[PDB]
Write a protein that binds this ligand. Structure first.
Ligand SMILES: *Cc1c(COP(=O)(O)O)cnc(C)c1O
Ligand SMILES: *Cc1c(COP(=O)(O)O)cnc(C)c1O
Lengths: 347, 365
């Protein structure tokens, strides 16, 4: 009472998994967390979740190693992000480690659902919605937190790393400074459906999100973007856009920056990336690799960019892709328990 | 893009046990009290289903519903008014219907026939007619919603959707017919929408992020938010209302100005009505042009501002008396100037809406 829900108070009642977590918030505080069979949600028609998008989510993977032990990849970063998203849309705060322990217990009940094939895992989807039975745009004192799980079977059609189809049109904007693009809110995704369809009929599989008067490369679909090149100063570097408001702080993004910094072989920085710099670098043969990063596709190569209906080839595949494969191998090693690391949380 | 549901295919299920009526003398909070019935229509792979109109009940949604994860949701807001002869009427519902599937087209929900939904809503209000209040400035708020209902976690076009309409009786925004002003926080750090964005559609996603800014307006002691856009600080919206400025322009001409529909402005029904009304009078210049803080600041020190107001069916016309910008107070002359134009707009809209003056803008139920 008077604070957050506790995993020690959990209520147990024994393509998605068999069970789900559910926690309710109402004025005075949180109710106890419930692990119950997968079932439909019953919401009032005036629920603020459906009218004013008082909704946020998270996305992380649970990996089954060779020793058959299930582990979550840096879940503390997902919990940090979830709480920041909650504060912004201006829902109840909760204790990050209590939600983690509740999710741990949920994955434990559905442990048989975690796949062990190469490139497979269990997708954990936590959600927090406003559940106020009112049409007023306000702080929603009733709320609902739920977690659902689902097995995912390899991103790539086989085991071969395949490059993806980008469209770069300045008329479409995902996020803005002073906006809400740095939080995983449902509201940022709905508007992308029409843009993705526009990309598909223009011969592209995904969208390269441009921002500002100087056409800054921000995100690749629902992934962060990275460019491995020799910059205009002659130094070999790995660059990704900074957290200035328009970028979603990805867990894989942070991990790639952390790993590359530890190696100390090349410069690793956060510095926006304009189409002017990319066009110049391509023409000068300074670009090595360009990729997207995210939970779905850990490291995802890009081979051409349709900018103002262009056919700009990105030489990612003819440069190995050396860094992508190194990142993929080291991540697989950490995630599937082949090497012990502080980044993994055992379930 | 697969036609529509028909009003002729609408069945009916009356309530077994009705909700409690508030009563003409007890406090009505906006959007917390609901009527006995609701409209609901489902869409899937075969197309649209039949409506029917059922008792007020909770929605049953799959946990992976795209409405809850990726905000595939939109809404409308219009009012039904009851005159002192018991006749119920809707204010320009065709425009709300026009604002509907444009919103659905955007994120990327099924199309429907505007007149078929209008007939279904008309019938729903007729069923719950006893819920429409009588008192001075009271009304029934009508809330149509269309959501994506896909049972998967992919960010894609839903193969399943749900359209529903709920009703709620609301009190007068201004008691006694006497308009009162609001103060606004103008902080450029928070942006509601951007060009190439989705602020020109009534989608749920544009509202959630405004809750924190509204709370920051409250803490800084200011009656609602003034939404600034760009490095030039363009005045765009007043909370969930369109903005209008009545002043003598820099060129020396008396005018009524409101921002143009360039992508950051929601095309309000009241906004369009005020423009239509002002143009029909032909007493002053009516123009759609960007308004900046620099222009407002210059007009204020030169004494050229007469009235500044917000527009949009909860309030119709809402006066603004103060704007907190750059930690400094800007006293807006709205109130000392009558407020003449606001009172004229309010009287005209009140007379049209409650049927005291007949107009083609009103749709009978
Ligand atoms: C989820 C997401 C990412 C990547 O985040 P990860 O935590 O690394 O999965 C990047 N950009 C957007 C827009 C996202 O939604
Ligand atoms: C609803 C709304 C308006 C006003 O629209 P009306 O149709 O006149 O009710 C204006 N701005 C915003 C941001 C709105 O949501």
């Amino acid at each position: 009472a008077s604070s957050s829900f506790k995993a020690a108070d959990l209520q147990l009642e024994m393509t998605f998994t068999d069970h789900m977590l559910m926690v309710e918030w109402n004025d005075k505080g949180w109710g106890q967390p419930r692990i119950q069979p997968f079932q439909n949600l019953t919401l009032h028609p005036a629920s603020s979740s459906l009218h004013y998008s008082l909704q946020l989510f998270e996305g992380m993977k649970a990996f089954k190693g060779k020793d058959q032990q299930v582990r979550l990849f840096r879940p503390w970063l997902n919990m940090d992000r979830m709480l920041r998203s909650a504060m912004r849309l201006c829902l109840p705060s909760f204790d990050k480690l209590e939600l983690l322990e509740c999710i741990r217990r949920l994955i434990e009940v559905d442990k048989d659902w975690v796949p062990d094939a190469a490139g497979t895992s269990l997708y954990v989807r936590p959600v927090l919605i406003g559940n106020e039975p009112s049409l007023g745009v306000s702080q929603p004192r009733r709320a609902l937190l739920f977690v659902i799980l689902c097995p995912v079977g390899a991103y790539f059609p086989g085991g071969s790393v395949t490059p993806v189809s980008l469209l770069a049109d300045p008329a479409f904007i995902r996020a803005w400074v002073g906006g809400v693009g740095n939080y995983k809110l449902g509201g940022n995704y709905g508007p992308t459906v029409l843009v993705q369809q526009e990309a598909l009929k223009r011969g592209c599989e995904q969208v390269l999100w441009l921002y500002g008067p100087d056409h800054q490369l921000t995100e690749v679909g629902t992934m962060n973007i990275f460019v491995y090149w020799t910059h205009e100063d002659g130094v070999l570097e790995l660059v990704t856009p900074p957290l200035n408001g328009v970028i979603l702080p990805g867990v894989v993004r942070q991990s790639l920056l952390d790993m590359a910094q530890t190696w100390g072989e090349f410069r690793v920085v956060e510095r926006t990336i304009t189409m002017k710099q990319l066009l110049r670098a391509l023409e000068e043969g300074r670009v090595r690799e360009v990729f997207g990063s995210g939970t779905a596709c850990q490291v995802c190569p890009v081979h051409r960019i349709l900018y103002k209906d262009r056919n700009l080839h990105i030489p990612t595949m003819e440069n190995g892709p050396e860094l992508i494969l190194r990142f993929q191998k080291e991540l697989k090693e950490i995630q599937y328990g082949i090497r012990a690391h502080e980044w993994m949380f055992p379930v």
